[PDB]
Amino acid sequence: YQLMCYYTSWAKDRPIEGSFKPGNIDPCLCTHLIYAFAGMQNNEITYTHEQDLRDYEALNGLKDKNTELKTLLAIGGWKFGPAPFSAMVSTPQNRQIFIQSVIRFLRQYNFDGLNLDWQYPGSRGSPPKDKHLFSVLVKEMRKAFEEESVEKDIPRLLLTSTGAGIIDVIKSGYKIPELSQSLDYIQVMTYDLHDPKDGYTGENSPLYKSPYDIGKSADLNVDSIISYWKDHGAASEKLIVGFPAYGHTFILSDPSKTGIGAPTISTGPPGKYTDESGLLAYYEVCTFLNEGATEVWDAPQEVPYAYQGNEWVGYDNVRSFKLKAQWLKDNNLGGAVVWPLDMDDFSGSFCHQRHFPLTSTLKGDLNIHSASC
């Protein structure tokens, strides 16, 4: 199995004891490290800030400590949106400029591959033709990587893509059989499934549906999402399941209604370190529990939640990661991706479960081994 781990460029800018740098990464923890994110300018991949080049050096320098470790550079994400990708795939010239820039950039900075993270082809303003054009881009990029490998007599660069977790988004953006042919891996975004607009508490990444879920809400779970990708032609071995190292928060309408599906008012207030309304890092959830929140296990969804007063959080813990890792192995999947590694308890100071409790759980349960480790 694979165990991929995201490192986000902005984690180092958090308050110091919650800040994370590539040097704080245990080189033997993961099989792949993904740097989020590269930028784009003039249809070419590029760095977003001057400091990113020092980050690339520190991250890729970890390969001297684990010679089997692979690194990937991600481009895109939710905040970047669809418009730069729609323009880049629109013409063969623009796609060639991009692909050539990627080969030069990854080789210069010692990355092992690219992770495409277009959110999303075919939605958010991206027209229906982008579902076809994204598939064309991926095929052309895989061909160019194969050609470079043969010409230079060096291992081929890896090509991965994220894959939506929302069924309607998958339908409008992904030619699944063709994408599965050309990609090395599809990183399925089995998280942010809390449906904040619904007006009820929901889990960020439940393994199974709640008995309270109806209609499309019954598909907002790991099992249904991965089943959809496999039923529509994705290779099981290429599917990498998203494992979030955070939860989502809500304000309850009634402090006496605290379960899953309880009425809500809004997202919860930002955490001291992550500073994002509606989100808490796993290490921040540990503070919430340490300071008195009531912890509950929901067996139908196989995930925890916690509450205090009118504050409620749905998240993932060691138990839910262990049950999901067993499910992953039982279903012959390719592995897992931790999103983001910098929200796991990297220091061990918040949760008292040693360094990286969530990711270390997957390392052991997925039998991750490297001969250099």
Residue numbers in the entry: 1 to 373
Q: What's the paper's own text on this?
A:
Although mice do not encode Gal10 in their genome, they do form pseudo-CLCs, made from the chitinase-like proteins Ym1 and/or Ym2, encoded by Chil3 and Chil4 and made by myeloid and epithelial cells respectively. Ym1 (encoded by the Chil3 gene) and Ym2 (encoded by the Chil4 gene) are CLPs belonging to the glycoside hydrolase family 18 (GH18) and are unique to mice, with no known human orthologues. However, Ym1 is mainly expressed by macrophages, neutrophils and a subset of circulating pro-repair monocytes, while Ym2 is produced by lung epithelial cells, which could have discrete context dependent benefits. Ym1 and Ym2 are among the most strongly induced proteins in the airways of mice after allergen exposure and both proteins readily form pseudo-CLCs in vivo.
However, only in 2000, almost 100 years after they were first described, Guo et al. purified crystals from the bronchoalveolar lavage (BAL) fluid of viable motheaten (mev/mev) mice and mass spectrometry analysis identified the chitinase-like protein (CLP) Ym1 as the sole protein component, thereby providing an unambiguous annotation of their content and distinguishing them from CLCs. Individual crystals were harvested from the BAL fluid of mev/mev mice (carrying a defective protein tyrosine phosphatase Ptpn6 gene) developing crystalline pneumonia and C57BL/6J-Tg(CAG-Gal10)Bla mice (transgenically overexpressing Gal10 from the ubiquitous CAG promotor, manuscript in preparation), sensitized and challenged with the allergen house dust mite (HDM). Crystallographic studies using microfocus synchrotron X-rays showed that the crystals obtained from the BAL fluid of mev/mev mice were Ym1 crystals, in accordance with a previous report. Native in vivo isolated Ym1 crystals and recombinant Ym1 crystals as well as native in vivo isolated Ym2 crystals and recombinant Ym2 crystals were crystallographically equivalent, sharing the same monoclinic space group (P21) and unit-cell parameters. Moreover, X-ray crystallographic studies showed that a native in vivo isolated Ym1 crystal and a native in vivo isolated Ym2 crystal are structurally similar to each other, which is not so surprisingly as Ym1 (Chil3) and Ym2 (Chil4) are two closely related proteins sharing 95% nucleotide sequence identity and 91% amino acid sequence identity. (C–E) Structural superposition of the X-ray structures determined from a native in vivo grown Ym1 crystal isolated from the BAL fluid of mev/mev mice (C+E) (yellow), a native in vivo grown Ym2 crystal isolated from the BAL fluid of a C57BL/6J-Tg(CAG-Gal10)Bla mouse (D+E) (blue) and a recombinant Ym1 (C) and Ym2 (D) crystal (grey). The low root-mean-square deviations (RMSDs) establish structural similarity. (F, G) Crystal packing of ex vivo Ym1 (F) and Ym2 (G) crystals revealing their crystallographic equivalence.
